[PDB]
Amino acid sequence: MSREEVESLIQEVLEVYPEKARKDRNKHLAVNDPAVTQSKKCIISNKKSQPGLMTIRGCAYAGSKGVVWGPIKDMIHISHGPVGCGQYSRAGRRNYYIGTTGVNAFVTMNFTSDFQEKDIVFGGDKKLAKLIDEVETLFPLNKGISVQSECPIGLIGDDIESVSKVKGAELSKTIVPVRCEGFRGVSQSLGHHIANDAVRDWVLGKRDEDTTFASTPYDVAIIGDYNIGGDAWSSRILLEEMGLRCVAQWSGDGSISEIELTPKVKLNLVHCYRSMNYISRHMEEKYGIPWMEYNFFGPTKTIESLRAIAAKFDESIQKKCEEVIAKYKPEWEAVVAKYRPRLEGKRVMLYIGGLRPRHVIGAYEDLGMEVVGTGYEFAHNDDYDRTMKEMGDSTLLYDDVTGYEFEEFVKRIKPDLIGSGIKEKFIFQKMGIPFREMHSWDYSGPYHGFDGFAIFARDMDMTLNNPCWKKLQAPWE
Amino acid sequence: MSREEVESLIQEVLEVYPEKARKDRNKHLAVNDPAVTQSKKCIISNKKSQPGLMTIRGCAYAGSKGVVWGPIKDMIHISHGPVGCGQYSRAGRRNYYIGTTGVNAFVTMNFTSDFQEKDIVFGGDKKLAKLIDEVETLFPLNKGISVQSECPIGLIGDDIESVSKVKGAELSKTIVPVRCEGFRGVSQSLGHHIANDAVRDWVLGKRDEDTTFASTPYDVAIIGDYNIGGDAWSSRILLEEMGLRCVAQWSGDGSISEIELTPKVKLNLVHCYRSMNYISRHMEEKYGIPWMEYNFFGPTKTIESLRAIAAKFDESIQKKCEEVIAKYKPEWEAVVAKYRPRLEGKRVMLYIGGLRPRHVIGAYEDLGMEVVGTGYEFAHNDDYDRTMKEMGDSTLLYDDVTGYEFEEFVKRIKPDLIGSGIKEKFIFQKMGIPFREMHSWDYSGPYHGFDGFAIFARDMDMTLNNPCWKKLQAPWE
Amino acid sequence: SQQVDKIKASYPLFLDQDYKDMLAKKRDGFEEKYPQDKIDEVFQWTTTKEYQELNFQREALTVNPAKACQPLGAVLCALGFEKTMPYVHGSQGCVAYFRSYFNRHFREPVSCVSDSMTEDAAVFGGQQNMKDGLQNCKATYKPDMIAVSTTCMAEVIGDDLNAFINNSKKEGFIPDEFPVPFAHTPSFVGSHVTGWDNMFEGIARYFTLKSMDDKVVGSNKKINIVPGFETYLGNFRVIKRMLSEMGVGYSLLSDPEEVLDTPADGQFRMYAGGTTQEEMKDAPNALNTVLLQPWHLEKTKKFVEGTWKHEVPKLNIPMGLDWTDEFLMKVSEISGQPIPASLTKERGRLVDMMTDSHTWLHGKRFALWGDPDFVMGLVKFLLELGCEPVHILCHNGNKRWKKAVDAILAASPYGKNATVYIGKDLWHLRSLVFTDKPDFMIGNSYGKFIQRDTLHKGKEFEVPLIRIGFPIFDRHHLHRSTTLGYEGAMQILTTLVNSILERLDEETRGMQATDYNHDLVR
Amino acid sequence: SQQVDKIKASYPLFLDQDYKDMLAKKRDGFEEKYPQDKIDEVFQWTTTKEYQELNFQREALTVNPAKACQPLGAVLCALGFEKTMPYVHGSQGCVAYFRSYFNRHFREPVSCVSDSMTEDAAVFGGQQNMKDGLQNCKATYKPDMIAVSTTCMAEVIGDDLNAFINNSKKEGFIPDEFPVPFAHTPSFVGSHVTGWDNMFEGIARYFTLKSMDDKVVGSNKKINIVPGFETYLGNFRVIKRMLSEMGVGYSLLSDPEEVLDTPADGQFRMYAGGTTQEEMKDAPNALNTVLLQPWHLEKTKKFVEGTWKHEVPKLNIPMGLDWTDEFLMKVSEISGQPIPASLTKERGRLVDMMTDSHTWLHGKRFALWGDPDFVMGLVKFLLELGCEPVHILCHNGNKRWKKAVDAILAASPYGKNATVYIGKDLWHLRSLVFTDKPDFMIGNSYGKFIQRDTLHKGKEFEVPLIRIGFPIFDRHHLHRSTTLGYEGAMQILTTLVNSILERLDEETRGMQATDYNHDLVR
């Protein structure tokens, strides 16, 4: 709104920084223009954070262990290093799964080597081999081990690749070494890249020579959906109602066998482009599997995605797609009729990770809500290429925003709702602004698909229109 | 010992009273002499309380509704009068039963007529008939209605007998009017008498002309056991292991059919003489059924009672009795071996209603404990005749003791443990004396039989030897 | 049989095979029990809407009431004065029941006496009973005051307390200067809160009615606080703390929190704390009188406004956020003291808790019961949290109270599904929770049986109980809690949200069935 | 499918038939899952004593630990000083994880920064990182103090904090007078409590080591209180309240209760309260220093005794009756202030609660885990109540602490069946609760999964969890509780007895099966 005001606000916020930090941060804040197609001319992304400025970014270990490898349920994932990292990331992400924990599923469990001073001084490869033996003894029904590195592993001269090779040859088990040390990269995105490379190098090609899996022309894989609150399940059902067959989903509620069967499918359906574009491009190049993006956020995006997917197949699939759309139309129409009057005209600001800042806009507009600012923690420039056409004119765009910047922007813009993570929720709640968690769904969800849209609308209404937001000022003040 | 000291203590305590109260209370405190067989020459009981002296006694409604009629599970008992009495007595007594509450059992529920001013002014007989109709409508599986009177019913001139007769003829149901108004009598004892008279007049003789019940020479009834904490059950099993057949059980876990079948048994086994001697004497006079007292408190009394019961039957019953005693000997021997070293030499003071102050001495002596004082709230002079021979020389005997008297006697005697009710527990707990509830078993039990003796010993040890009794004095005091 | 290493109490010893066979033999042989299928059919019928229609047609039968009688409240009021003996003129069984009730709720000694009226007094009256009882009570327990109430027995014969106490004083049974306030508390009128109101009005009249000539309003720069029937010690504590933090002079009349919270240090204290006779005599000199629970202090309000000439403010119970704010601003206006920053920070902290827990609180459905002021404060707080009160029950409420509660409900969008019931008992409430299932119940211990019944229908039909109210018999030390002010609101909010979260945890503990939603972080 | 009137979240929407069929098809078609009988066999094997023997032979594998790393405790210590910014020299992922952890436990904003060291500093060092970070942090957030700790990355490369901060000051990045205390907190040594100790020692050294010439012991007539790692605001509050009631001058060093309990009133406060620099500079002038949690304040004790010349008393954590009494008498002896009557009455009231609940508490078996001082205080209190600690676990404890705990256990007859485990994790504890079943567990939220496992074996094998400790993620506002003093003992006692009573209520709710023991009065 009123572009010159937004640029003035940007300058006023930047006035406080030292010259180096101000000059750097000036390249990461922008005023959106929907006509612009290339983001390199307006915003700069995927760079190192300025020291001492309260960034929100994580590390490559979080991007690899917590995002990509952790949701794999039948594998045991071992945090190689000191005790803190696996403890802070244990069950913090709501990647839902079905299994018997401790027997054949291990998602919420924390396996670690628990480095001491002696391990730092004299290495930890012998400890790693002994620990792998112990894992094999105590958890027989596991189907593969991954070793996720923390910072000291890369800092000291540890060679986890040789240990993994020897122990895998000895036990006839898949052991995947992931060099996802924290100091690599600038954020979790290099963790995504490293985890995808490990998947390609150690898992994806097991059944290249195997041809015992019967294949159908309607075989698809779900890539980049991590089943937050059941999200992937809420997507999968729709695809099965269309008549497709979902051979695998990466990686929420995912098994290693599904990953190894993925090269046998006819189409890849990529949900999170940011974290899985590497593996999808590799399979297109190697196995010739086409991949396409889809968006199941809100009825409009869901219907458009379903039609786009069905067009990739024959006419029976399109007929089933129309049947599914007709079946689900009354339910989301009822949701819209109930909740749009309570949410029309509200203004939303978002600060999320790599995919969701632009994916959720359509669902918000399906309830009459306008997104006035958005930003990414770690996403690349192609993500901003998509976002710039996704958003409106004179809206605010921020990359790797600092706490001070986000607080000042929110003070000036005064949105009705903010969607961000755990580290901004209470900051903006004490400020008197409704806040929804857009990583964990505030322990609600799923939000994907038609069944998720109802939950999304109910949550928006329950937080935006709660009475507690009208009680922050004492009557005597 | 020290009889002269005990008498001097009695005089010192009585010194505070006014002349009338002192003269009255002097007849209710005594120093026991085991050689004395007539209590009327020693102590006086069953008299009205002195006003304003904080007695512990209840009323006739408590003795009838709460003690005798309430445990009958398949009957609905209606508190005729204002709302308070049935509310304070609802589920306060732990008479255990098996049934589906609200459908075919109604023990823990409170049915009342809830008198208002209009009911007081214009009577409540029409309200009673309407209420009986509503009871029949809403609780079809009930097997009889009893109407327990409160004070205003007797004071305003209501004719509940006519209503009961008319509605019983109309509905073909047994309706028992009980004139258990509070102001009659001096305690719950007249409630016992009135409830027994109602049982005799309205229930006991229903199957006098009915001879379809097959009878065996080993038919007994349990009379006066109210299944506190399951006590009656813990007795019944032993009798069934002896080979007897328990036809009725008065009145804990009792049904109206058992009461009506009682006149068909070969022997009555009276536990509480005080509350059931009336009905047992009536059945001896009318049906010729002999009755005998028994005591299942502690292994010694239990074994003696079992042998005394078995002597009333043939030799097969005696052989079964010997088998039962042999079977249960190791268990109570183990209990004694475990708990007597922790409880030997301790001194106990008791104040319970009408049977338990004398029945529990044997169980205490089975753990090496000496009872130095005992007393009754409402028991008669024959109860003291039975009591005096069971207690030691120069021990204290008190009838309808006041709070001030009880406190001063405990202060002078300093017992290791006191067993009394809810209204003295916290009084003696703040004094630093261990206290066990001897009405409700402190929500523990059962205490009857061999299975109950283990619970009794564990409870005595856990309360007497608790560390909290050594912490009442601050270290800086 | 018992193993000495692991002894079993009634549960689970009676679940052994021998006891089970004994019980089955007893039932099959001598109980003439209905067939189990018939019992199941009747239970299912009692869970239906036709049964509810029959149940609400009741006119003469009360099943499981949610109230007590007046002399219980009179005793509780009398306990709040310094070295005062509660004395109930009537039958001793009433006093035994009152003492047992209060002992089980408070887990403390409760002192009360009776004159033990019998059938002789039922014919001739209880004048001699009162003379002897007053003399004996004063001689034995040495109180500074004897507060006399009545049982229904003495009410029905029409015993004149004033004349009987006057004759006791005239003939030398007790000194003429000894204070003996009295109140008629008929148990067939009202409930226990009515008895509290009657006893307080009697004591205030006794100490102030005849000596009003030298009274000037506002002379002692204090505010009188009348709490009413209260069974949470934290409520007295929080009122006193909040008034002290404002620097406001106050006089709490009928304060029993010291005598219900005596320490265990090797001695028994029959009396502890309480309102002094000097405070009660000086009460007309206060700036004003504030009644914390105005819906059962009507007689007290009439006396204070008519005699003391105090302009009693129209205040709701200080429960929740808005009503606590209104109480604080009214006290500030009366006394001229500004509201301190500590209370502002406490209010902000409560608001922060509300913001933190609003997501788990929103849309939840509650059935609830209790006393009128407590019930309406609870409804107000639940509306403030975005919760849905659905079945609001108050056995001792009236029509004006119901109209006020309906006005509260109509002002909020969350009160559209709420129904208020006056004069209904807990069997009605059982029918309501079966036919229109809420998420939770709020009430005293008598609700536990209702939960049991719901569990009999099926696990998906269980309505868990949250114990707020009087009496609570199956939990320990809950009477130390607070329900008033910001602190009480925080305690209630914590209890509610954590009850919701334990229910969710229990419902998602099934391995490989529902434990996909067994989240570490909630 | 969704009904707009009753929308379902993940639970129980995924229990619908269509979702169940989808999941069954997915598992049967593409997951290559083990047969359910094989899974059941392996689970039963993991519940056995042979599995426990294999499990305790572990030497290199840690499964579900019960501790964190040092910089988390360093951040918590730094948060307790006035207008102080916690600054972790190292990698930014660590700071993200620390902030998320504390946000989830406290439900409050937590402020911390890092210098964001990357692969470049892995060979050059983080000198430029520290210069730029100190300048940027001071310019942007305006702290009065920056407290520097380290991550394992900078510890492994061997970054010299002292030299780097000195070079930052010398070259003008920050003023020379600006306070920048620092501490090396290697995450491969000790745990979070060790980091708290290191950070406190660094701050105290920075403010006192070079200016000890004009210090006289006892000049300010105060007692220094060092709390250590603490995540209950009620503990700070109760210590301050008890010291104020005695009339004892005190200085609480590292007090974060204000900054972790800010109000919601429309503004964001990055800083609130905390120990001032004047208090820390004046600390050597106190009469003495009292350490509340002495088993992770060894470095602090060495510094205070060696440098400040304070004769630090040998005191246990003031948890439970005896240790609270000892703490109060030691404080009274040090300051010369008598113990007031209010604290005597509070102690008596706690003793009264103990007397009331001893029957339900006696003989109960508890597994428990946590931090060393917290754990030994819990064991002492449980012994005082007549309860039986059986499995005592502390992942970050040592051999001397275990010897002290064994000495405590041997002094009590209720410690006969207790075993102390040091260096064991929660998978060991799962084995222990399976093989020697206790009645209850006491611990943080990570215990919930153990309960789930026990429920999988059978309802008679479930071990319910009582949440006392850090962190608690699945309940709201439990961090406001108290575990210290008589008030903390009362809260713990109430929670324990009521947990026992809810378990008993749940076990006796079966109609006509076990509800013969569903008592109204307990």
Ligand code: ICS
């Ligand atoms: S993987 Fe990525 S930060 Fe694509 S690291 Fe992050 S479960 Fe975010 S915006 Mo948390 S690139 Fe997924 C994400 Fe998006 S953990 Fe989740 S919500 S769609």
Ligand code: CLF
């Ligand atoms: S950036 Fe990432 S989270 Fe940080 S360490 Fe590095 S991989 Fe890990 Fe675990 S132990 Fe603690 S938190 Fe660190 S300092 Fe040593």
Ligand code: CLF
């Ligand atoms: S001695 Fe006994 S308990 Fe007393 S009344 Fe009489 S029958 Fe009953 Fe119920 S209602 Fe209250 S408590 Fe009484 S005063 Fe009117």
Ligand SMILES: [Fe+3]
């Ligand atoms: Fe008590």
Ligand SMILES: [Fe+3]
């Ligand atoms: Fe908060």
